[PDB]
Symmetry: D2
Amino acid sequence: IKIKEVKELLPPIAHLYELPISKEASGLVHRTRQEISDLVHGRDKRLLVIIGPCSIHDPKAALEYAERLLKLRKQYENELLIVMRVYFEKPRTTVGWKGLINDPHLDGTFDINFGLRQARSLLLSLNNMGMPASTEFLDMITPQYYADLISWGAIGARTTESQVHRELASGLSCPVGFKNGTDGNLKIAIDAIGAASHSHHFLSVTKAGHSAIVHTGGNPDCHVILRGGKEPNYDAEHVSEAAEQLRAAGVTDKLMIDCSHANSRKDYTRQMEVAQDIAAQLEQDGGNIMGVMVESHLVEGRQDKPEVYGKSITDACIGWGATEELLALLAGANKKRMARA
Amino acid sequence: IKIKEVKELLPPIAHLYELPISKEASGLVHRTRQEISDLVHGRDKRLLVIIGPCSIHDPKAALEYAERLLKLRKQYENELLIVMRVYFEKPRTTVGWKGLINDPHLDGTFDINFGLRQARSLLLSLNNMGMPASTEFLDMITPQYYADLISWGAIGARTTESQVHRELASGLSCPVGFKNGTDGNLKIAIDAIGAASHSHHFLSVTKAGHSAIVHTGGNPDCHVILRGGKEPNYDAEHVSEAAEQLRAAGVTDKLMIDCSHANSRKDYTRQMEVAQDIAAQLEQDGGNIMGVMVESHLVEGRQDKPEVYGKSITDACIGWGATEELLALLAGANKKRMARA
Amino acid sequence: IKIKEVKELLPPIAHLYELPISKEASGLVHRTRQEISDLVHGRDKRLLVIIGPCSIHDPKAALEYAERLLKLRKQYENELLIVMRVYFEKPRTTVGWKGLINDPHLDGTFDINFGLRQARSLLLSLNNMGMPASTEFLDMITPQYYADLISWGAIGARTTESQVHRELASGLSCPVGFKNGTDGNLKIAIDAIGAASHSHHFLSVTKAGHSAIVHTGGNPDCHVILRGGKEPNYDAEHVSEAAEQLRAAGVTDKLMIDCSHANSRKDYTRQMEVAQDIAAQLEQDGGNIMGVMVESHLVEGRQDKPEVYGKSITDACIGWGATEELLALLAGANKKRMARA
Amino acid sequence: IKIKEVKELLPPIAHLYELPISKEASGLVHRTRQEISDLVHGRDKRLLVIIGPCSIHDPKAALEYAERLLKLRKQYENELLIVMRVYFEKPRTTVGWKGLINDPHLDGTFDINFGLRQARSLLLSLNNMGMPASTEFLDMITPQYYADLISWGAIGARTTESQVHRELASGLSCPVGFKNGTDGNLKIAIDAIGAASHSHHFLSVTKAGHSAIVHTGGNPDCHVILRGGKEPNYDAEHVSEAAEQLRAAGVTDKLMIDCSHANSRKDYTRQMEVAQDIAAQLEQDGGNIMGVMVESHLVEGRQDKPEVYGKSITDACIGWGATEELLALLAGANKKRMARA
Ligand SMILES: [Mn+2]
Ligand SMILES: [Mn+2]
Ligand SMILES: [Mn+2]
Ligand SMILES: [Mn+2]
């Protein structure tokens, strides 16, 4: 009774067969993961910029966004390592649309086989055009379908404390950022990095769709993300305090700052103020900052229904023009940080 | 490449074949779930008491504990509905032993097939002798191996905000309690009840060990568990405030109070003080209280290595004598509440 | 031990997702099966003609063959029910190429996943143009990949006596012809119809690639195929004797005659002689004949290597010109049989 | 639609977990296989004697039979290599009971999971007491459940010509005997050896119950079994003709003779007469003979319903006293053949 239906799911290998990773995508992913690892461990001083839509609901608008962003990725490549946000899985406060995978037709039909196909296809097209991709890993089974095409992964604020999410991260091939908790707790993200760096044994699902025991090796390229709590936590004093806590736990004291969510108090117009503060830190010193996150789309704001093209149906985003402004600000500031060497 | 090995896992059907649920277990589970549902919705005024070890590491001692507890379950049955804690999965702050399923030989061999077998076998013997069982559902795959034998489930403080745990709960056949967050946030637990009461579509693993899309019906019997935060939250004034919030979200305002963890501040001896405060609430009014949780074993305290029989290797528990005292206290207090009707 | 390796196999559902059966193919298949069932039980007097290549080794040629045969299928539709031979699985006397599924690139690479995909795709294109398809079911696992597209099936002379093939036939949705044995034993085909008409329990593999127990309903539309032994068995006397045996076993006394294999002494130039004999039987009486089988391709003969387009690499076939002749012979003869209403 | 239901099947790993092969069973199987291989290729001149019930329908009687046979296996070990017949799969002419796996309760309930469990359990008890085991491999999926416990396999007369059976044999770790066809055709057995000695790619089912592509290495230890046809084929003249044909095909000219089935025809006691003829051949020369097959039980004859203990419900068997006599005859004769070294 509590389970109304069990439905057919295609295993990852079906999608892999139709959409094998190309040589060029495979090289881009490999390189971008190493370049990000370098930032995490303080070997390079470019700023990782994870930027793009709160959520992907329309592949067409995503590829249009990617095309515009790719120009800026290239233009700023000596200062910034730009990776697009390509988020397919959304955690809700209670209920709501959980993302393109879970319900790609945006109407309660839950066509997950289509969703996974469409996700893999978009990620392959992105990597093929030269745009690497990032996503939040929320589900335990979906990652086998597309993790080979992801250069950087997030664990959400709502799952940073979760032991199964820490286990998942311990087996991912990409670097992973763990967000502080929804009321501001940083210690859980520091503890997550500790957990995810270790080997684990746990149950998962293979590429062929069958359950198995997996033994992971640990992920050495995890870091923390500052995304606000009851109050914002992006400023120099908060960064300095986090770095101190990170060092005391013996993990990397390089961290990423989210300009959106609780750092902008859920007002997309405040993302630019955050980025201005970060720019000012980078100009002064800013040695503990390795990255920033930005919720950005073609058109600003949000809507309940997907009426307007290139506008978020989840958290409100800045628009394109404001995106060019914010990237130019961050690239100018980091150029100065990098020259201080 | 961050995956060191993938190992063979027996599907649930293998364990179900060797250990089918008996008529008597099945009847006990079905009726205990309905009895608890009645407490969650305020139809009955007995107190649900979830009591037993922080963790199971030794089935033999668990059965000895269960035989003692069964006499009290019977004695107090008009005032208390006593259900044993049989927790096979432990969330750690960073790393550590994750419980009997994950590493039943307590030595880092991760014999999960044996662990699942042993979990199911203990649960079946418990239900067969008349003692119903409760556990924390932490892993997404393990529950198909033994959920049929569980009368009440917990979602931990660290995972209440996790969407995949809310989805799990929405498909469970037992009532589920959601703990408030580790620093005291209640809202996430109230939100979880909202989420878990609804229907979801998500990926899970069948009894045959294959991935599938599952469509759940929603769980109408979820409630909150007060387990402390930065400060304890067990007293009347916290109960009253939680009840108000619960009513404002339109969900059940009957809740459970954990005498252990952050409500005792990690001093097991304080579980009795908490239970005394609860008793005084039940005596004065206590209409919003439907249950208590208690970490109890044969022998009090804790130890790092499993040297002493019937003594915890995880959180410190009260011993058997203090357990008899606490249950007498709660039964006398509730008998008065119940007479007020 | 003596297994050199185990390799990844996509389950049927992967192929069904990429190549769903169309409305029109589904209607054609349903219709053709009922029409054939009518022949098997003597409800209609058209002649079923199973005609085409010994084996498919080039889908392009097969589609060209089909487009030609389609014009004859339409032209003769009141006298003949023409169904194309689309055989993907070949039994060898010892070793040799086992067909397009087993080794589609014809070079010992055994790309079975490609082979299955290609088989399904050809079958679907055939049914979509209006040509129904027939095949030999030799393998126990391959049928789930394409049986939905097959209007008539054979069990080979080498497998008619095999219990696992009889079981298979008992669960197929198409009519099935059982060949007499390689030395001329007819009793095993009669026994096979008996067996295949009954319900069975046995092990098989689901559409999802998992082993299971299947309980079949029996196949009421089975019949015998006369294909020679030590000596040919196509003549009136053999037909009369077979009919008698069939009636004595209580099964349908309508049978099919193969013009090729041991009835032509493995000499493709002899197929026309057999068809002439059959025509003479239809002209005299021929009441126990419901069908013929013919090995036919664009170009006559055979070759060891696939050098010449539209020429067999297995048993030698008659060419297109000889095919037009044979069909016109059979249609003229059956028109007369049918007019004796 | 012609599938009335699909039912749950435990994979081999479930049975392997409850009944792992012991060290002693594993040593016995390994040793027996090699010893049989030595017979097949003429390195040792003991006679393989495959002896026991036509079919196993009662594990208790089978173990009692094995305890009696063991004493003779030991007594005759320098002359004879005695292996018990433990046949769980039976090919029927049309329909009938297909053996203990397919329907263990002998009542049309088709409890295959119980049947596979019982089969494995008996085979393990037999190997543990020191009695090695032989069986006919008829089904494609069942072997994974118990082949590890089999020292010699047969392919039946009915399936010798079947390509999927030849494939199966190519992947078996035991020596395999192929029977001549039901009407006496020896060539198909000789062709089967050729086939089974080669490497093949085909679809099969893994120990975890999932379909896969398998690549076999070929079985170098196959041989022919003379089991009669239109006429018996056990005498010196038939053996000499078979040896010649075997040598002309370039395979082993050491063969086995079945005393039962079409060699003894309608009189099971004629098995003794066949064995007397074989003994006389061994005394005279008999260089091409490497083994015999005998259908033998505690009690002679056969019955339709399993009313008498230790009596066949399939083909009629000689009784225990005749079994002692036949073994003594064969051992005395072979002792003389061997002394002519
Ligand atoms: Mn967002
Ligand atoms: Mn605890
Ligand atoms: Mn042919
Ligand atoms: Mn027999």
